[PDB]
Amino acid sequence: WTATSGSCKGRCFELQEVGPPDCRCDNLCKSYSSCCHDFDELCLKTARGWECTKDRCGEVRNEENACHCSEDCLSRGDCCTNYQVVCKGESHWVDDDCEEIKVPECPAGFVRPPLIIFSVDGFRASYMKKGSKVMPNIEKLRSCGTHAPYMRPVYPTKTFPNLYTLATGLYPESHGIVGNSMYDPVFDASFHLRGREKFNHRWWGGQPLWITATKQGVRAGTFFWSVSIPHERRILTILQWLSLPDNERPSVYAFYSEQPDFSGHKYGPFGPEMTNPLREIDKTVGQLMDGLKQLRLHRCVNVIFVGDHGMEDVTCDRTEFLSNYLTNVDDITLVPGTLGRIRAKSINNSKYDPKTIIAALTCKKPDQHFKPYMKQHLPKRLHYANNRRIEDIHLLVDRRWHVARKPLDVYKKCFFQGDHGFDNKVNSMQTVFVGYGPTFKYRTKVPPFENIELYNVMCDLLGLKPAPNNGTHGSLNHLLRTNTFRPTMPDEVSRPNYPGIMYLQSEFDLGCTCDDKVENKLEELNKRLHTKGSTKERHLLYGRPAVLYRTSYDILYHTDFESGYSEIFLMPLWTSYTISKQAEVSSIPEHLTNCVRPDVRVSPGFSQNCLAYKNDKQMSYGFLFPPYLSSSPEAKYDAFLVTNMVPMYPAFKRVWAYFQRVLVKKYASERNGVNVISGPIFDYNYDGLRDTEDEIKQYVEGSSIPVPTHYYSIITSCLDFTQPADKCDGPLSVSSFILPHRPDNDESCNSSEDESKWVEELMKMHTARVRDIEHLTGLDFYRKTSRSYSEILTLKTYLHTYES
Numbered sequence: 001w002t003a004t005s006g007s008c009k010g011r012c013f014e015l016q017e018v019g020p021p022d023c024r025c026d027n028l029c030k031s032y033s034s035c036c037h038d039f040d041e042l043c044l045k046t047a048r049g050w051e052c053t054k055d056r057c058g059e060v061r062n063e064e065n066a067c068h069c070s071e072d073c074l075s076r077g078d079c080c081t082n083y084q085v086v087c088k089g090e091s092h093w094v095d096d097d098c099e100e101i102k103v104p105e106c107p108a109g110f111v112r113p114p115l116i117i118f119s120v121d122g123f124r125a126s127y128m129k130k131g132s133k134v135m136p137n138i139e140k141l142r143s144c145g146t147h148a149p150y151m152r153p154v155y156p157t158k159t160f161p162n163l164y165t166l167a168t169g170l171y172p173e174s175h176g177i178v179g180n181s182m183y184d185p186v187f188d189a190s191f192h193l194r195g196r197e198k199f200n201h202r203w204w205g206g207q208p209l210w211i212t213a214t215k216q217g218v219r220a221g222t223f224f225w226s227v228s229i230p231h232e233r234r235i236l237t238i239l240q241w242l243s244l245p246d247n248e249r250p251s252v253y254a255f256y257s258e259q260p261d262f263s264g265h266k267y268g269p270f271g272p273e274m275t276n277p278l279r280e281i282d283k284t285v286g287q288l289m290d291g292l293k294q295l296r297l298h299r300c301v302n303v304i305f306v307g308d309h310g311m312e313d314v315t316c317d318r319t320e321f322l323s324n325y326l327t328n329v330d331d332i333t334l335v336p337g338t339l340g341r342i343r344a345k346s347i348n349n350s351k352y353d354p355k356t357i358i359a360a361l362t363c364k365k366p367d368q369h370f371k372p373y374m375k376q377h378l379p380k381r382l383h384y385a386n387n388r389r390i391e392d393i394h395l396l397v398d399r400r401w402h403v404a405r406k407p408l409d410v411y412k413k414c415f416f417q418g419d420h421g422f423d424n425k426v427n428s429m430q431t432v433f434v435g436y437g438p439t440f441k442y443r444t445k446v447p448p449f450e451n452i453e454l455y456n457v458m459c460d461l462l463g464l465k466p467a468p469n470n471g472t473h474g475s476l477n478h479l480l481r482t483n484t485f486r487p488t489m490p491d492e493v494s495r496p497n498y499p500g501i502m503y504l505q506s507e508f509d510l511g512c513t514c515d516d517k518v519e520n521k522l523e524e525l526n527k528r529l530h531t532k533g534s535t536k537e538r539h540l541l542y543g544r545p546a547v548l549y550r551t552s553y554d555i556l557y558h559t560d561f562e563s564g565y566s567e568i569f570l571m572p573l574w575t576s577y578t579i580s581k582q583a584e585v586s587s588i589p590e591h592l593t594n595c596v597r598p599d600v601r602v603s604p605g606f607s608q609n610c611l612a613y614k615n616d617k618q619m620s621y622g623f624l625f626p627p628y629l630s631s632s633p634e635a636k637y638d639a640f641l642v643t644n645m646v647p648m649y650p651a652f653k654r655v656w657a658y659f660q661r662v663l664v665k666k667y668a669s670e671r672n673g674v675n676v677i678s679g680p681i682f683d684y685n686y687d688g689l690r691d692t693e694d695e696i697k698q699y700v701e702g703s704s705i706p707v708p709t710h711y712y713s714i715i716t717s718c719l720d721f722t723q724p725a726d727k728c729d730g731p732l733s734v735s736s737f738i739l740p741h742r743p744d745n746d747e748s749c750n751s752s753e754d755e756s757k758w759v760e761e762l763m764k765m766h767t768a769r770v771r772d773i774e775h776l777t778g779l780d781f782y783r784k785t786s787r788s789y790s791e792i793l794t795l796k797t798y799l800h801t802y803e804s
Ligand SMILES: *[C@@H]1O[C@H](CO)[C@@H](O[C@@H]2O[C@H](CO)[C@@H](O[C@H]3O[C@H](CO[C@H]4O[C@H](CO)[C@@H](O)[C@H](O[C@H]5O[C@H](CO)[C@@H](O)[C@H](O)[C@@H]5O[C@H]5O[C@H](CO)[C@@H](O)[C@H](O)[C@@H]5O)[C@@H]4O)[C@@H](O)[C@H](O[C@H]4O[C@H](CO)[C@@H](O)[C@H](O)[C@@H]4O[C@H]4O[C@H](CO)[C@@H](O)[C@H](O)[C@@H]4O)[C@@H]3O)[C@H](O)[C@H]2NC(C)=O)[C@H](O)[C@H]1NC(C)=O
Pocket: 170, 171, 173, 174, 175, 176, 202, 203, 204, 205, 206, 383, 386, 387, 388, 468, 469, 470, 687, 688, 689, 775
């Protein structure tokens, strides 16, 4: 209940919220049914539209007008954005030549260049090129400022998850807005686009930019705009706020457009009807920039033009129905559409079996346009599991498709031709970034990057210390003319041990065997050199990874590879080796098929044992440095050390063996040598972070040998592929993966076929950034290179996406 009978007289678009039941005069008031009775009359004037004409020039001020062409308007801050053009012979900003902004050119009283975020819903990356001839204001920002060819949104590629990621630098699993609709099982409440529930603060976690700003004494405009406030009025409100006195004026502003999303849904991304919304958004940018130029702020303000997601061709007829797969379809709730999330209809049910639901949804039709997953099995690059609002069962839907529960859900609601929400690596989902202003570079192209990184940059732009978030601070330094953040490497926490030969063979009782009793001094000092790190410069190209937590581990050197061997987890944390373009693949000789050898540098008590693998009828083992790539028959024995062994499901060994035997050599042929770092990952609580020992839920039967959730590899080479990986003078090129360690290959529908028809497709889907692996391992890679730390931070955030 409000007392809506105060007045907005002198408080239109006031920045401090007045609390119930005084009546309100701000953007939210509409959505709360709490506006004063005169808000429309005073605050939402429309009379005479939004443009000066010659006849209005010099007019007598009439306060009923939407905007003003009177002589006093620049001082009152309320001229129509085109006043100076019509009434004073000035040019539109778009018609002026691009001129470099080397320093901020601000009116007196400006302590810092303001930031304006201009967000556009559904603005697909390729609109920058395909629509360029109708968006001259946007094209100027883009060619004269700093731009990327595209920006990668977060998953799901929906509006609220992405805008709240922009604001926080957090993954949706961390900020809590994990979908455009959601059910919270603790709240027993649903969030939707319609309704008042979405307004409750309990949904929205982390610390958004506007709060970061305010806590540190920097004032912010609104980031929420009521749908009924026309764009022209949002722009005029921002320009009025920018004319406030120094002590009252905000430093950070946002503008949001519902377009082109709203039309894209109706017409598809490139429907003929989409030309006009692009023209309209462009006009709005022109208004803003003419408005800045009137107020002498067009060489002072930093402008970010950014989208939340793209838009794909999706029609009612490309819908998969769960009713065609399940008998028990009335026992589930589905969050439908361009993703699927499934939970039980009733928690008063011990009868609900997710395993039977998954099984009924797996590889059932040859054409199937979705894939089911337990959420902890989703590609770790999606970071989409560690929240109670994400249901255990997920369906990743193919681009261009929808999933629904039953046909009536689609006809008892074709409306639509476009939609979004797919996998964030999908080309059609990519969106836009442009930065223009004194703090951005001039006429500069940067590589594609992720929207999670922008929070740190917006903080830098405003001199704010960012709250803890998921960006990598410094990875986007190359966007900026002047950086206030100087990244430095984390300090190594655990120093390695460097063990020599300390144990006799008969001290081990590991139940292993090997055929290795097959006896020259020229090659007896030569192998000694190898166990002490004589080839270490070849196999460890970027220094040893730093261990960033407290543990006990050993560096072990070998002719063909180096490792960091954990005495706690009884296996390498990492294994590093280089394969040249020239290198040969060889087989495991017959006599060595089951060979495992004690490592005399490592005590029996800190070693794995073969007996446990014999006794564990589910679990087998593989090797991190692959025997197939031994430099010599003699070096091959080192690959069979117990210290190179790791636990592997037979089903996973199909994947791993094909990678090691076929793919590593291919990459070395294509990339002119590769350096590989491989290791295990333990993430039993699916938080994206290295598990402590006491979080491990599975061991090799009757042992302390922990079972990894995942295996990674980081594959690095020279960006200039005319140089070999091991003698690169310049920038590097990387691709990485995090493969789930699963006891079946149900995820790959063609897995009954030869590995050459399915393994690589799997690995591509589980592409990863180096940073992802860092979080999962507590390692820090690329410690010793000739490259700047900023550049290395960009490299660590790169994702190889495998789109055309
Ligand atoms: C991406 O970036 C983010 C941000 O840096 C990072 O997320 C951070 O992860 C940290 C480690 O997991 C975690 O640390 C502590 O969490 C709590 C503090 O909780 C509150 O306070 C902060 C600060 O203002 C809030 O941000 C935080 O918000 C979260 O929870 C809200 C509801 O409370 C929610 O609205 C919001 O969206 C957010 O939810 C998310 O996080 C929670 C967990 O925090 C998840 O469960 C959700 O799913 C969602 O993902 C909170 O309001 C501390 O109390 C913890 O302390 C533990 O652990 C100690 C380790 O030093 C240990 O020594 C102590 O014993 C202590 O244990 C005690 O409690 C145990 C668990 O409850 C108990 O078993 C035990 O026996 C004992 O009593 C953590 O130090 C941050 O909160 C988290 N922040 C955010 C915003 O998410 C991500 O990790 C990265 N992602 C990647 C992949 O890099």
